[PDB]
Amino acid sequence: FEGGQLPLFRRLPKRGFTNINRKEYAIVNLDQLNKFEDGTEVTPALLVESGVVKNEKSGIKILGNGSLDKKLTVKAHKFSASAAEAIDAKGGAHEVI
Amino acid sequence: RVNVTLACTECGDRNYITTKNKRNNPERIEMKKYCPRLNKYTLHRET
Amino acid sequence: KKGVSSTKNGRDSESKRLGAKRADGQFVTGGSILYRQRGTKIYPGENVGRGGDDTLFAKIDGVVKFERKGRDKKQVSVYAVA
Amino acid sequence: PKMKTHRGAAKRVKRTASGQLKRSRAFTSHLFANKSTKQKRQLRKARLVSKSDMKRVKQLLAYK
RNA sequence: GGAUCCUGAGUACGACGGAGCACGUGAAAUUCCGUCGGAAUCUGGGAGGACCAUCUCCUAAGGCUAAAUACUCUCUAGUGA
RNA sequence: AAGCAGUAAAUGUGGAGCCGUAGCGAAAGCGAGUCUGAAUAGGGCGUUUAGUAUUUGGUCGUAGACCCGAAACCAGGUGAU
RNA sequence: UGAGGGUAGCGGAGAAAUUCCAAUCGAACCUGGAGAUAGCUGGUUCUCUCCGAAAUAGCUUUAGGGCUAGCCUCAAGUGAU
RNA sequence: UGGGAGUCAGAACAUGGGUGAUAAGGUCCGUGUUCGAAAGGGAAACAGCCCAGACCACCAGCUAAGGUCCCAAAAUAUAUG
RNA sequence: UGCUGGAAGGUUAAGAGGAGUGGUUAGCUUCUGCGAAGCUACGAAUCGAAGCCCCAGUAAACGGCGGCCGUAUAACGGUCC
RNA sequence: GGGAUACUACCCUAGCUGUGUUGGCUUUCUAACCCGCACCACUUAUCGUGGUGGGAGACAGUGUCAGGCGGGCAGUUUGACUGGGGCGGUCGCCUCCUAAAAGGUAACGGAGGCGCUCAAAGGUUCCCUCAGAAUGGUUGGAAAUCAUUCAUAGAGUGUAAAGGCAUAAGGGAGCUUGACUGCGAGACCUACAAGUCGAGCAGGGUCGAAAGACGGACUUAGUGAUCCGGUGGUUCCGCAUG
């Protein structure tokens, strides 16, 4: 309050809404996988244990910023474009659940 | 001297606005101008 | 107090801050303003746009040169030497 | 107890990357017949809160 | 098996107006109120927060119910940077 | 964290849960890109490590909230010695 | 003029006058809400050092109140800016 | 950059201007200065004028504004009128 | 104006007449209406109490009991209202 | 001619009878229901009770719903500025002067405009170029119209004043429709809200042979958030899925 001069929050208009089931997942980028081996199957509950993930949010999803140093295979929900790209660049693949 | 909010040929909503008068310009006017679904200056008409 | 009566003429305009904003030798931006006027007191010359309200801008970045324009008028000549 | 939040203001702005707050403009949502094109373009935008009002309001938003 | 049978009537439900239910006769779909009306009885019905399809859960209108909680006029004993 | 062993303690036990580690966009979505979309452009937001838990101090906020002090309003009662 | 009775506060009474209804009334007194409220006055408890203002915009059902700006202070950073 | 504030009644002089009556120790703006928030000396006393800022001593000295017959420190000084 | 009264010329609730109907969909045709007899529910031709106009009356009701030229309905003729 | 008799909604001009059965309106009954309605008595309680007869009577009243009145009642409001309140006034924008040669700035201080207008007064090519003055003459109230020569834009420019203007931004001829979509670094303003000018970029067209040049009028004013409501489209979502 400012002594009657209009609050900003009625000077300005309400907008927008919430897609109430907003879905982004337990996310993970790339380079964290360097802890693992080559060829090793890297799975959801594995990574839960491994502690790159603390819990599932709405599933899992990936992003390609890091660098892998590990040809190997995954079982995931979701992927970026670069994601499976750079899996199979070294090789290995993505049993996309 | 009053307003005119025009309906395009097929651009399908309420975009363009101008001034005219029903005394100097008593009838429905129309002329060329750029609409977006076309990439060109097409004709549009009064409603 | 007592009867003081109807009363009118206290009417004036919330002003505008006109004139210049930059000066001789000074270096500028692309959408930079150089002057706020009305009419033409000065005349855009080199690399100078003129917006609607007789506002002038320099089309480029660079430095300024005011100077005479006619025999008795004045202009601008922006140069982007660097 | 717990603070509460200005729900009406929650309905009115978006938080940013660092800490800032992205506001929807105003002078909209009605007639633009009396208006111009550059205006309708530059109002189809969104801007930021200023630190001044931010000081005014900082304790309002614990929960964004 | 259930083929047949009993399955909670002025009830359910609706209109009106009032509250409550975070939420405005409301969405109040849910639940009560008072005035008018006013149902099926499975082979049917109820819901699924505008709302319905399909789908699903249940099968209303009959009753009883410890434990896990609450406060201290108490009493006892004790404690008090 | 609740909760539990414990003893009006610690400690231990206790992972439901909370924050962060990717952002963009009302949203659908996408992702070091995203939004707008016509490109990335274009610019906004980004982008390009370090934060976390407890505590001290300051400040703010809700609770009378530095202290005293009205006129008055309401509810229920007393009074015609 | 007495002794006994009857009228109650949004009310009573009233040869009317805001006049009376326990030394007081333009609607009493007791308690309670209630630490009612108070942009209003007053008040606010030992020391030394260092820095050190303002009384101006501007919008206000606002003018002796407020809000930011302004001008202070403190520590983080920068670096001649 | 960010943390914590108070200030919104200002006053007088010079100065500029308006207004008023080339009124007002007026009134409104402005440019300076002092007080407020700053003691000391000078103007007899004399918040704003002149000189001028105190860290504490000290029976030391030099000067400023101003002053030099007595109260009261300093020239009855010179020379001129 | 208020009060009463009235032709009531007509205009006027809670009242009726009924031609026809969501979101989703069992319904007449597998590009398609009898709205019938279907969940969060519905239409007009028309009239329609109190009244609303219209007209009377209405001054020990309220009210006015006026005004101009010549004139401090304080005279008069022109006088208006 | 005044509508208008094929069928004819139905028909005043109707007639007539009540029919699945019922109430249209008014009556008669009366139980209902009532009766501060009189006699009998429990109860010497005549209260109440219940007979009695009489009344009225399906009426109102009563419950809900509805709508007209309602200082009878109750709670609120009843702006500020102000050389005290005060009546008067004024309260939102634009031009100038005060304003002190950057800008900026007061006064219940001085003067003036505004709550729009131009589809041509706009856009774009190609022409024109002053009123006015005298000069002077059918006109003539000198002057109109016309004409000679100078006139400073004194012309004039849609909207007050200001600057500015013959690049004409003034005036015409023709063309038309940029009074275009999606953007823009950037800069001004300012406390905030806001507000203001843009290179240019795609794009794409008008006119123009083009060159290119047009993102509304020479500038400035033309009412004002937001919520709410409405409307149409709709990368959206929208509930177990649809």
TrEMBL record, chain A:
<keyword id="KW-0699">rRNA-binding</keyword>
<comment type="function">
    <text>Binds to the 23S rRNA.</text>
</comment>
<keyword id="KW-0687">Ribonucleoprotein</keyword>
<feature type="domain" description="Large ribosomal subunit protein uL15/eL18">
    <location>
        <begin position="27"/>
        <end position="93"/>
    </location>
</feature>
<protein>
    <recommendedName>
        <fullName>Large ribosomal subunit protein uL15</fullName>
    </recommendedName>
</protein>
<keyword id="KW-0694">RNA-binding</keyword>
<dbReference type="GO" id="GO:0003735">
    <property type="term" value="F:structural constituent of ribosome"/>
</dbReference>
<comment type="subunit">
    <text>Part of the 50S ribosomal subunit.</text>
</comment>
<dbReference type="GO" id="GO:0022625">
    <property type="term" value="C:cytosolic large ribosomal subunit"/>
</dbReference>
<comment type="similarity">
    <text>Belongs to the universal ribosomal protein uL15 family.</text>
</comment>
<keyword id="KW-0689">Ribosomal protein</keyword>
<dbReference type="GO" id="GO:0019843">
    <property type="term" value="F:rRNA binding"/>
</dbReference>
UniProtKB/TrEMBL annotation, chain B:
<dbReference type="GO" id="GO:1990904">
    <property type="term" value="C:ribonucleoprotein complex"/>
</dbReference>
<comment type="similarity">
    <text>Belongs to the bacterial ribosomal protein bL33 family.</text>
</comment>
<dbReference type="InterPro" id="IPR038584">
    <property type="entry name" value="Ribosomal_bL33_sf"/>
</dbReference>
<keyword id="KW-0687">Ribonucleoprotein</keyword>
<feature type="disulfide bond">
    <location>
        <begin position="8"/>
        <end position="35"/>
    </location>
</feature>
<dbReference type="GO" id="GO:0006412">
    <property type="term" value="P:translation"/>
</dbReference>
<protein>
    <recommendedName>
        <fullName>Large ribosomal subunit protein bL33</fullName>
    </recommendedName>
</protein>
<dbReference type="GO" id="GO:0005737">
    <property type="term" value="C:cytoplasm"/>
</dbReference>
<dbReference type="InterPro" id="IPR001705">
    <property type="entry name" value="Ribosomal_bL33"/>
</dbReference>
<dbReference type="Pfam" id="PF00471">
    <property type="entry name" value="Ribosomal_L33"/>
</dbReference>
<dbReference type="GO" id="GO:0003735">
    <property type="term" value="F:structural constituent of ribosome"/>
</dbReference>
<dbReference type="InterPro" id="IPR011332">
    <property type="entry name" value="Ribosomal_zn-bd"/>
</dbReference>
TrEMBL record, chain C:
<dbReference type="InterPro" id="IPR001684">
    <property type="entry name" value="Ribosomal_bL27"/>
</dbReference>
<dbReference type="GO" id="GO:0006412">
    <property type="term" value="P:translation"/>
</dbReference>
<dbReference type="GO" id="GO:0003735">
    <property type="term" value="F:structural constituent of ribosome"/>
</dbReference>
<comment type="similarity">
    <text>Belongs to the bacterial ribosomal protein bL27 family.</text>
</comment>
<keyword id="KW-0687">Ribonucleoprotein</keyword>
<keyword id="KW-0689">Ribosomal protein</keyword>
<dbReference type="GO" id="GO:0022625">
    <property type="term" value="C:cytosolic large ribosomal subunit"/>
</dbReference>
<dbReference type="InterPro" id="IPR018261">
    <property type="entry name" value="Ribosomal_bL27_CS"/>
</dbReference>
<dbReference type="Pfam" id="PF01016">
    <property type="entry name" value="Ribosomal_L27"/>
</dbReference>
<protein>
    <recommendedName>
        <fullName>Large ribosomal subunit protein bL27</fullName>
    </recommendedName>
</protein>
TrEMBL record, chain D:
<dbReference type="GO" id="GO:0003735">
    <property type="term" value="F:structural constituent of ribosome"/>
</dbReference>
<dbReference type="Pfam" id="PF01632">
    <property type="entry name" value="Ribosomal_L35p"/>
</dbReference>
<comment type="similarity">
    <text>Belongs to the bacterial ribosomal protein bL35 family.</text>
</comment>
<protein>
    <recommendedName>
        <fullName>Large ribosomal subunit protein bL35</fullName>
    </recommendedName>
</protein>
<keyword id="KW-0687">Ribonucleoprotein</keyword>
<dbReference type="GO" id="GO:0022625">
    <property type="term" value="C:cytosolic large ribosomal subunit"/>
</dbReference>
<dbReference type="InterPro" id="IPR001706">
    <property type="entry name" value="Ribosomal_bL35"/>
</dbReference>
<feature type="compositionally biased region" description="Basic residues">
    <location>
        <begin position="1"/>
        <end position="15"/>
    </location>
</feature>
<dbReference type="GO" id="GO:0006412">
    <property type="term" value="P:translation"/>
</dbReference>
<feature type="compositionally biased region" description="Basic residues">
    <location>
        <begin position="37"/>
        <end position="48"/>
    </location>
</feature>
<dbReference type="InterPro" id="IPR037229">
    <property type="entry name" value="Ribosomal_bL35_sf"/>
</dbReference>
<feature type="region of interest" description="Disordered">
    <location>
        <begin position="1"/>
        <end position="48"/>
    </location>
</feature>
